[PDB]
Amino acid sequence: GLLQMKLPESVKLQMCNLLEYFCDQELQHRVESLAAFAERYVDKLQANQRSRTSLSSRLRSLLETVRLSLQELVSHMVVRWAQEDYVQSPELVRAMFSLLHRQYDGLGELLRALPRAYTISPSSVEDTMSLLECLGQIRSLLIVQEENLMIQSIGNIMNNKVFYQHPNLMRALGMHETVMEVMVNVLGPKMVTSCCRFLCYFCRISRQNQRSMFDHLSYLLENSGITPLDVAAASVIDNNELALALQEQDLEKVVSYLAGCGLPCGGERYLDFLRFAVFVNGESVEENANVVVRLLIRKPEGLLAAIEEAIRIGHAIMSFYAALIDLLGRCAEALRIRAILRSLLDDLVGIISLPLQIFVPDHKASMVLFLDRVYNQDFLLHVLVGFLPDMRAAASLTEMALALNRYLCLAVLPLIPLFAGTEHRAIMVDSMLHTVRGRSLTKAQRDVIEDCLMARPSMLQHLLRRLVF
Amino acid sequence: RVAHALCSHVDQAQLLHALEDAHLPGPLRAGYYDLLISIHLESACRSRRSMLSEYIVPLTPETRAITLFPPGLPGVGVTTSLRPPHHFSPPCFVALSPAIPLEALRDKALRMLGEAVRDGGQH
Amino acid sequence: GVQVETISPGDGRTFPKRGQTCVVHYTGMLEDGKKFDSSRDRNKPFKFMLGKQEVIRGWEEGVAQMSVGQRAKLTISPDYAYGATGHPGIIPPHATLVFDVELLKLE
Amino acid sequence: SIISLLDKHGRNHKVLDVLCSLCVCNGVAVRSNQDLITENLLPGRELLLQTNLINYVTSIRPNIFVGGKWYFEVMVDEVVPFLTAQATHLRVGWALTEGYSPYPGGGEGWGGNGVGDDLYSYGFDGLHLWTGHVARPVTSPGQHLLAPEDVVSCCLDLSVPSISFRINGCPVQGVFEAFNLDGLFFPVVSFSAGVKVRFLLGEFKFL
Amino acid sequence: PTHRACNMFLESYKAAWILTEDHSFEDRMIDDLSKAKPDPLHQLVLHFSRTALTEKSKLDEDYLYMAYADIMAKSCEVSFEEKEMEKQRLLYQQSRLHTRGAAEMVLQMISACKGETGAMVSSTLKLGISILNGGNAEVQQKMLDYLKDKKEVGFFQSIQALMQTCSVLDLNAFERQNKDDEFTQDLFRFLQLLCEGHNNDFQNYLRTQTGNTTTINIIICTVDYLLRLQESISDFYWYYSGKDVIEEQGKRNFSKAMSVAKQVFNSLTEYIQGPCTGNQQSLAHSRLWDAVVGFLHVFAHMMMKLAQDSSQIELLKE
């Protein structure tokens, strides 16, 4: 024999490693037999599934068998190594007992082993394997020309259809964590950005992953002090359920990043996150939004002058004050502080700036939503001046022609004297003529029937006379 | 690309001759071996550690009926899982991942094992 | 420029032509005469299409001179080889290459 | 500058430990600087020690040393040129007992025959010669290497070392001249691999 | 769904139906490490100890160590004499590691934990619980000796920053959780285990840390933990009291906070429980009495709020 034969230690290392291959293989084959047991079991399950529990006893017969001279002589020989020596070389020993533990609880070892195990369809194997090789490329890059290969990986992975087809695999791979580690490593270089947009799109696909990266996001934000932030919002917006779970500290760090910026685009991005941080799929949660709102005022401490000087013409700080309004707009005992928004009507006349406005769409898209969330039919007659841009509507037939389809939404938003109303109603009848994307135009038809519900009525019947034409 | 350079400069076959004799001094040998790994084997394995760790599997017909237990052996050639093949283009000095002999080599090393065991047991 | 010289004469007839995949043994050494390659080191013959520009230019010129079964010493100029760039990690810049080629068969 | 330091200091192992330290970080590495190490080393050949291998070389001589003109015959019964990685050795030439003491276990730049200033030699492609193991490539009248055919033959005039090899009745041009007669001269035939050669002496052919 | 489903079979199989019974192995494993100068298990121990001694500023998760800490973790007149034989069987299970000097190392790792809140730390602490239970004073004294011979400073700091932080149920968390405190429990139970068997020398040494040039009173800090958890309790009152009935998960979770907090109070009880007059001085300087008031308050009302229903008293009991 060989193993039984005594030799000095340093061989012992290698030898036990040689053995680790064995145990590893046993674990592998075990997973595999488990899978065959799976495919064999699913049959009758689909039978009862279409038949619309007692059988289960038979699997019990094979269930206990799964648990397990071979492993025994290994454990024993390890003990012999540890007996007659007082060995040192901690590394050696570490391996030793690693193996030994691999011997004494292959059950639980199997358990920790399972997650990374995953079945795949035989048709799809080719693309998967290649993806594994590219993943192995990135893992080759784990230890690091710098700026291109990684991107090769990136592109290569986006090309894969498996990335849609097996999201659970992609979560199982844990690769997100890897590539993110690369990111951090860089952050301690231009390529970084596409890579980041990669990890972002990766995050996008599923909640069972969006969770995961959501767990990383503070860590990502320490990094976002330097666009990772995009990744963060991608990790948050789709799922309210962990949007609830977000730490305040994320946000304090976000505002902390809002400090000497104002001596900006990075500041408008910080705003963009917190814009995405609450409003979510539906109505912004009162949870997060409250904790946001508590701190909003704290870091800023004639802004309309900065606004209109900007409208007239650098292009950064203006869109900071423009995004900030939408930010304060989407957020909302809560009746106590929700009134403070309006104090810090904090805009008020700034609403009327929107009328002066006609770069541009950010300004309407921010302030209209600021207005609908906090704010009188006659006061609407005061508002009658978004109609400026309805005058601009025919000019499409530039940074403008294509802009109408998002203004198609912005017109619909404020559903919530008289001859002036005949006029801006006739602008809307011009939008009916535009009806004479397109389903959003049907929502504009809903804005029309809602304009009929809203409301001298007879001047509306005059705009309905031009509309009778 | 560096490794290819070394293949130019140390020669796999040279090391293959370096596998044989005891007369070759210890550490230097250790270098020739570690390099023999290094020049070639090391990368494939480098990836392979993780890949084999992954334990992912398909549904090829063997896999649905691979079975297992006797009323036990390990190094079966079934299994598969996945795990990518390692490519190796030979270092052809003409205009990555250098080639080495495969089965030849395992035969060599295995021969070294037998040589290691038949005298190592006698001590 | 190139100065290839024949070693063992072959059939003396069928020189390599366009598109042919030449099958040859050889070794590569420097102006120093230090080796940096050998087909025998891998034991496996090396095979290359002609005119594919897959080779150093001097190999493209000189091997065409070779007949079937022929052995030939190649004195290829660096300008026809890796040249002033050199071969990264292998061949130093402005080094004439010296080969001991032996064609087995045109393919 | 560091490699250059090593070249300044000759063979100091410490510098190399420095180099491997340069190569690699805490785990990661700067591949580029390493490739620079290689281009600055491996092409440079000369600074780092370097290695290869030959096949065993074995010279043969007739028993009698010479100190008139003499002539001898060496038929080539066999050549196996490319067995193993090395091209088969089979140099042939004159020599003397002090500047040529062929120990097979190495010495001189990769060989045994043709290496000495005291030895004078012949073989392979283009015929020609080796002194100092220098390959002066004097072209043959026409041509061929060494294969199991040629009756290669040699002569040497007394006093004057006007050696000139002959390829099977065809002399290999003008060759050696003017050398010391320090000790007796004798004929030599080195070889390698599975090779045989016959002496038509006691049987003359070409004189 | 076919293969899509098959993974679902994997994970289903993974669950409780396969979280098997076979866990008698550890003990015979532990004997196997101690068959046989030094013992193999002891070699494990000095191994991990070596793993501990080295600087890492933070620490390696080292799954291996937490694992063996788990392995060693496996060691658990009818009410007396049978309790006695079991008690001493446990004393053998504890002594068996006690020979190893394990405590040392565990304390070392724990000292190394510094500001960490890692899972492996839990494994360690749980190991400490595995050894210290049953009031093993001998372990406490050999530990203490290691605490004075080494005068580590940082161990107590390690406990302190943790204790300073640890975990608390708070409030908003639940508010969001509509649609680890257990570690704290475990930690401070551990701390109670430092003091059981009433080693007042050790308790005072925790109070003042005389071997070290530095000084710390851990217990002050656990009081403070009791404070903050109490303040959680209180806000739990000022929320829930207006709604009378409590739901379900808040109930059981808050109950588990009461297990924690109870455990804290218990730990204090051990802290003072002997004739430690100086610790009582410390509590003379402690803010402890408010700490009592607030429980008095919240319970004085909440128990009434829970008395509304018999479904509610399975909590009121707590």
Residue B122, classified by CB atoms within 10 Å of its CB into exposed (0-12), middle (13-18) or buried (19+), is exposed
E196 is in an annotated binding site: yes
Rounded to whole angstroms, the Cα distance separating A127 from E306 reads: 60
Rounded to whole angstroms, the Cα distance separating E147 from E211 reads: 8
Active-site option among C15, C76, C99, C100: C99
Contact between D145 and C86 using a beta-carbon 8 Å cutoff = no
Q: Can you give the three-state secondary structure of chain A, one letter per residue?
A: CCCCCCCCHHHHHHHHHHHHHHHHHHHHHHHHHHHHHHHHHHHHHHHHHHCCCHHHHHHHHHHHHHHCCCHHHHHHHHHHHHHCCCCCCHHHHHHHHHHHHHHHCHHHHHHHHCCCCEEECHHHHHHHHHHHHHHHHHHHCCCCCCCCHHHHHHHHHHHCCHHHHCHHHHHHHCHHHHHHHHHHHHHCCCCHHHHHHHHHHHHHCCHHHHHHHHHHHHHHHHHHCCCHHHHHHHHHCCCHHHHCCCCHHHHHHHHHHCCCCCCCHHHHHHHHHHHHHHHCCCCCCHHHHHHHHCCCCCCCCCHHHHHHHHHCCCCCHHHHHHHHHHHHHHCCCHHHHHHHHHHCCCCCHHHHHHHHCCCHHHHHHHHHHHHHCCCCHHHHHHHCCCHHHHHHHHHHCCCCCCCHHHHHHHHHHHHCCHHHHHHHHHHHHHHHHHCCCHHHHHHHHHHHHHHHHHCCHHHHHHHHHHHHC
Contact between D42 and B11 using a beta-carbon 8 Å cutoff = no
Which of A275, A267, A345, A350 lies closest to A307 in space, CA to CA? A350
Rounded to whole angstroms, the Cα distance separating B65 from A39 reads: 9
Find which of A30, A32, A119, A170 to mutate to test the E interface (most E CBs within 10 Å of its CB).
A119
A241 and A280 in contact (C-beta within 8 Å)?
A: no
Query: Would you list which residues of chain A are within 8 Å, Cβ to Cβ, of chain E?
Result: 34-35, 38-39, 41-42, 63, 67, 75, 79, 82-83, 86-87, 90, 93-94, 97-98, 101, 104-105, 107, 111, 114, 117-121, 168, 241, 244-245, 287, 291
Q: Can you give the three-state secondary structure of chain E, one letter per residue?
A: CCHHHHHHHHHHHHCHHHCCCCCCHHHHHHHHCCCCCCCHHHHHHHHHHHHHHCCCCCCCCCHHHHHHHHHHHCCCCCCCHHHHHHHHHHHHHHHHHHCCCHHHHHHHHHHHHCCCCCHHHHHHHHHHHHHHCCCCHHHHHHHHHHHHHCCCCHHHHHHHHHHHHCCCCCCHHHHHCCCCHHHHHHHHHHHHHHHCCCCHHHHHHHHHCCCCCCCCCHHHHHHHHHHHHHHHHHHHHHHHHHHCCCCCHHHHHHHHHHHHHHHHHHHHHHHHCCCCHHHHHHHHCCCHHHHHHHHHHHHHHHHHHHCCCCCCHHHHCC
- DSSP-assigned beta bridge partners for residue C97: C76
- List the single residue in A67, A75, A98 with the smallest CB-CB distance to E22: A67
Q: What proportions of chain D, in percent to the nearest 5, are helix, strand and coil?
A: 15, 15, 70
Which tokens in the block code for residue D205? 């052919």
Residue type (1 letter), A427:
I
C56 is catalytic: yes
Residues in chain E: 318
At residue D201, the 3 state secondary structure works out as coil
Rounded to whole angstroms, the Cα distance separating E266 from E129 reads: 15
Rounded to whole angstroms, the Cα distance separating A324 from A338 reads: 16
Q: Which domain holds residue C81?
A: 1-107
Q: Does residue A144 sit at the D interface (CB-CB below 8 Å)?
A: yes
C48 is catalytic: no
Q: What is the β-pairing status of strands A118-120 and B56-58?
A: parallel
Residue type (1 letter), A423:
E
Nearby residues of D89 by Cβ (< 8 Å), 6 or more positions away: D55, D57, D111, D112, D113, D123, D190, D191, D192, D193
In this complex, the chains that touch D, judged by 3 or more CB pairs closer than 8 A, are: A, B, C
Q: Does residue E179 sit at the A interface (CB-CB below 8 Å)?
A: yes
Region label for C4, one of left (φ > 0), alpha (ψ between -120 and 50) or beta (otherwise):
beta
- List the single residue in C38, C40, C89 with the smallest CB-CB distance to B2: C89
Other C-beta atoms closer than 10 Å to the C-beta of A333 total 7
Contact between B6 and D35 using a beta-carbon 8 Å cutoff = no
Where residue C20 sits, what CATH number does that domain have? 3.10.50.40
At residue D133, the 3 state secondary structure works out as coil
Rounded to whole angstroms, the Cα distance separating E318 from E312 reads: 11
C83 and C46 in contact (C-beta within 8 Å)?
A: no
Q: Chain D closest CA to B7's CA: distance in Å?
A: 11
Rounded to whole angstroms, the Cα distance separating E165 from A425 reads: 62
- List the single residue in B50, B60, B117 with the smallest CB-CB distance to A122: B60
Q: How far apart are the first and last CA of chain C?
A: 28
Other C-beta atoms closer than 10 Å to the C-beta of A238 total 18
Which tokens in the block code for residue A294? 């508590």
Contact between C100 and D87 using a beta-carbon 8 Å cutoff = yes
Helix (H) or strand (E) holding D154: strand D151-156
Q: Chain A closest CA to D32's CA: distance in Å?
A: 9
Other C-beta atoms closer than 10 Å to the C-beta of B87 total 10
φ, ψ of residue A209 in degrees (nearest 5): -170, -40
Region label for C93, one of left (φ > 0), alpha (ψ between -120 and 50) or beta (otherwise):
beta
Which tokens in the block code for residue A341? 């928004």
Q: What is the β-pairing status of strands C35-38 and C27-29?
A: antiparallel
C99 is catalytic: yes
> After which residues does chain B break, using C–N > 2.5 Å?
71, 95
Q: Does residue B99 sit at the C interface (CB-CB below 8 Å)?
A: yes
- DSSP-assigned beta bridge partners for residue C73: C5, C100
What was the elucidation method? cryo-EM
Active-site option among C15, C26, C76, C91: C26
Contact between D29 and A143 using a beta-carbon 8 Å cutoff = yes
Rounded to whole angstroms, the Cα distance separating A55 from A44 reads: 9
Region label for E284, one of left (φ > 0), alpha (ψ between -120 and 50) or beta (otherwise):
alpha
E215 and E209 in contact (C-beta within 8 Å)?
A: yes
Q: Chain A closest CA to B52's CA: distance in Å?
A: 9
- List the single residue in A79, A101, A291 with the smallest CB-CB distance to E40: A79
Residue type (1 letter), D86:
Q
Rounded to whole angstroms, the Cα distance separating E34 from A79 reads: 9
Other C-beta atoms closer than 10 Å to the C-beta of A204 total 15
E185 and E263 in contact (C-beta within 8 Å)?
A: yes
- List the single residue in A39, A133, A172 with the smallest CB-CB distance to B84: A133
C36 is catalytic: yes
Nearby residues of C54 by Cβ (< 8 Å), 6 or more positions away: B94, B95, C48
At residue D151, the 3 state secondary structure works out as strand
Contact between C86 and D43 using a beta-carbon 8 Å cutoff = yes
At residue D13, the 3 state secondary structure works out as helix
* Chain A CA closest to residue D27: A143
C11 is catalytic: no
D38 and B2 in contact (C-beta within 8 Å)?
A: yes
Region label for B97, one of left (φ > 0), alpha (ψ between -120 and 50) or beta (otherwise):
left
Contact between B4 and C89 using a beta-carbon 8 Å cutoff = yes
Sign of the dihedral defined by the CA atoms of residues D66, D109, D137, D166, in that order: positive
The DSSP 8-state label assigned to residue C83 in this structure reads G
Find which of B1, B2, B9, B94 to mutate to test the C interface (most C CBs within 10 Å of its CB).
B94
φ, ψ of residue C76 in degrees (nearest 5): -70, 135
E116 is in an annotated binding site: no
C66 and B38 in contact (C-beta within 8 Å)?
A: no
* Chain E CA closest to residue A111: E14
Active-site option among C15, C76, C80, C82: C82
Please indicate whether chains A and D are in contact, defined as at least 3 beta carbon pairs under 8 Å: yes
Contact between D34 and B6 using a beta-carbon 8 Å cutoff = no
* Chain A CA closest to residue D32: A145
Which of E156, E167, E155, E285 lies closest to E225 in space, CA to CA? E167
The count of domains in chain C is 1
Q: In E, which residues are within 8 Å of A292 by CB distance?
A: none
Query: What distances in angstroms separate CA D89 from CA D74, D83, D124, D188, one per listed residue?
Result: 16, 11, 8, 13
Only one residue has tokens 């071979």, namely: A70
Contact between C90 and B9 using a beta-carbon 8 Å cutoff = yes
Q: In D, which residues are within 8 Å of A144 by CB distance?
A: 28-29, 31
Contact between D29 and A145 using a beta-carbon 8 Å cutoff = no
D141 and D172 in contact (C-beta within 8 Å)?
A: yes
Find which of A140, A144, A145, A146 to mutate to test the D interface (most D CBs within 10 Å of its CB).
A144
Which of E23, E36, E138, E120 lies closest to E75 in space, CA to CA? E23
Rounded to whole angstroms, the Cα distance separating E283 from E303 reads: 28
Helix (H) or strand (E) holding D70: strand D70-75
Q: Does residue D83 sit at the C interface (CB-CB below 8 Å)?
A: no
Query: What distances in angstroms separate CA A454 from CA A42, A429, A450, E171, one per listed residue?
Result: 59, 16, 6, 43
Sign of the dihedral defined by the CA atoms of residues D16, D22, D27, D30, in that order: negative
Other C-beta atoms closer than 10 Å to the C-beta of D27 total 8
CA atoms within 13 A on the CB side of D145: 25
Contact between D42 and B17 using a beta-carbon 8 Å cutoff = no
Which of E197, E201, E194, E198 lies closest to E87 in space, CA to CA? E197
In units of Å, what resolution does this entry have?
A: 5.7
Rounded to whole angstroms, the Cα distance separating E106 from E257 reads: 27
Please indicate whether chains C and B are in contact, defined as at least 3 beta carbon pairs under 8 Å: yes
- List the single residue in B46, B80, B84 with the smallest CB-CB distance to A132: B84
At residue D162, the 3 state secondary structure works out as coil
Contact between D52 and C9 using a beta-carbon 8 Å cutoff = no
Which of E244, E242, E141, E249 lies closest to E195 in space, CA to CA? E141
- List the single residue in A22, A65, A120 with the smallest CB-CB distance to B59: A120
Cα A208 from chain centre = 11
C26 is catalytic: yes
Rounded to whole angstroms, the Cα distance separating E166 from E16 reads: 30
Only one residue has tokens 């009378």, namely: E244
D119 and D94 in contact (C-beta within 8 Å)?
A: yes
- DSSP-assigned beta bridge partners for residue C102: C25, C71
Helix (H) or strand (E) holding C27: strand C27-29
A365 and A410 in contact (C-beta within 8 Å)?
A: yes
Nearby residues of A344 by Cβ (< 8 Å), 6 or more positions away: A297
